[PDB]
């Protein structure tokens, strides 16, 4: 969440942009494919195993 230069994108923003781009490409190209989004290193938790 830190930007080395003032006019540049943080790693998180780049990752989110990439995820959205892949989502749109999949919607247009293959709409029957499966995609998921997970986060690690957070304070909250939400999973089947209750990790």
């Amino acid at each position: 969440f830190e930007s080395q230069s003032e006019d540049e994108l943080t790693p998180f923003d780049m990752s989110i942009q990439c995820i959205q781009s892949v989502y749109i490409s999949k919607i247009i190209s293959s709409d029957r494919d499966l995609l998921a989004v997970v986060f690690y290193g957070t304070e909250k938790d939400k999973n089947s195993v209750n990790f």
Binding site: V22, S25, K26, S29, S30
Partner: peptide, 23 residues
């Protein structure tokens, strides 16, 4: 394997359309 698509596996990454590029 080489030049494969990172979005749709099993398909080759199509080069972007370039239109007319005069020599």
């Amino acid at each position: 394997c080489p030049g494969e698509s990172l979005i749709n596996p099993g398909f080759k990454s199509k080069k972007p359309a370039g239109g007319v590029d005069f020599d």
